[PDB]
């Protein structure tokens, strides 16, 4: 990701395959403008829990993180991104998705398991070491098993921001 230009003007990119973001923290809110394709193949992987090499034209590598992104309607194509310059000890908080594995003891029973809340957010992530994922139990879950925040194993340190008793995944019944 070698974003280079960064002017209020985007003509020289609005046609030429390039997105256009902004990365900051509170110190520097450098103007920006990276390439479409790159961040296009990029963000896909790391998602909002994936800091990357930000050597803007001239050479000034910066560590940040995909904060929010605004893509086009009609066209599932993205248009504007906001990068949040990585910190050191604390960033803010991060948006972390819930995942299953192992067959569920509900699935074959006759019902299905529903991940009520896809991605989940947790208080204090801890920069440098931020879960770029989160795998969760489901097996135990039978006909009406609800798992919540207070349940999902944590990655040692991380503190769950969302309310505990909130249902994360529930193996729904048939029909």
């Amino acid at each position: 990701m070698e974003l280079t230009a960064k002017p209020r003007t985007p003509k020289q990119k609005l046609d030429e395959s390039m997105i256009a973001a902004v990365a900051y923290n509170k110190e520097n809110n450098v103007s920006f403008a990276l390439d479409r394709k790159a961040f296009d193949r990029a963000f896909r992987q790391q998602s909002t829990t994936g800091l990357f090499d930000i050597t803007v034209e001239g050479g000034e590598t910066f560590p940040a993180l995909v904060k929010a992104v605004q893509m086009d309607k009609r066209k599932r194509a993205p248009i504007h991104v906001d990068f949040y310059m990585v910190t050191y000890g604390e960033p803010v908080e991060v948006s972390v998705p819930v995942h299953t594995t192992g067959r569920s003891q509900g699935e074959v029973q006759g019902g299905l398991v529903d991940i009520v809340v896809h991605n989940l957010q947790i208080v204090a992530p801890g920069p440098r070491r931020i879960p770029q994922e989160l795998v969760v139990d489901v097996t135990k879950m039978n006909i009406g098993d609800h798992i919540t925040a207070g349940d999902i194993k944590l990655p040692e340190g991380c503190t769950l921001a969302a309310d505990p008793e909130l249902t994360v995944v529930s193996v729904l019944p048939p029909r």
Partner: protein, 136 residues
């Protein structure tokens, strides 16, 4: 389908989608790419279709309910005022919007539940999967 109680009438105007997310309530989804008035009955014509195709699961979401009453010609004349509050109920749907999005069933096993449904809609759509992470 039809709402429970309200005022009785309306109007008409348009411009691209506003509060039609993307991912949520499932993994796969369907998207309306064109201005139209989705007829409540044109939804059953969709739900009931997707249903068949899914012996079970239910994991079908219709986040487009019809908040609108259109009217009709009480035969012809023209000497009288507003008419036919009960012609039918509509659900104005703008581009990018999401009427459908299943969940759980295999890709193709979903790339059909829509295909079909599509066939009863007045507009041109397309199916979608993820990377949708604005507000939560």
């Amino acid at each position: 389908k039809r709402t429970k109680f309200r005022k009785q009438f309306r109007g008409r105007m348009t411009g691209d989608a506003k509060g039609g997310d993307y991912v949520a309530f499932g993994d796969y989804g369907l998207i309306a790419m064109e201005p139209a008035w989705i007829k409540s009955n044109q939804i059953e014509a969709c739900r009931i279709v997707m249903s068949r195709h899914f012996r079970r699961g239910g994991k079908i979401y219709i986040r487009i309910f019809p908040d609108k009453p259109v009217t009709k010609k009480p035969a012809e004349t023209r000497m009288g005022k507003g008419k036919g509050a009960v012609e039918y109920w509509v659900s104005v749907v703008k581009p990018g919007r999401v009427m459908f999005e299943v969940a759980g069933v295999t890709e193709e096993q979903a790339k059909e539940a829509f295909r079909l449904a599509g066939h009863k809609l007045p507009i041109q759509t397309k199916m979608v999967k993820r990377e949708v992470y604005d507000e939560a």
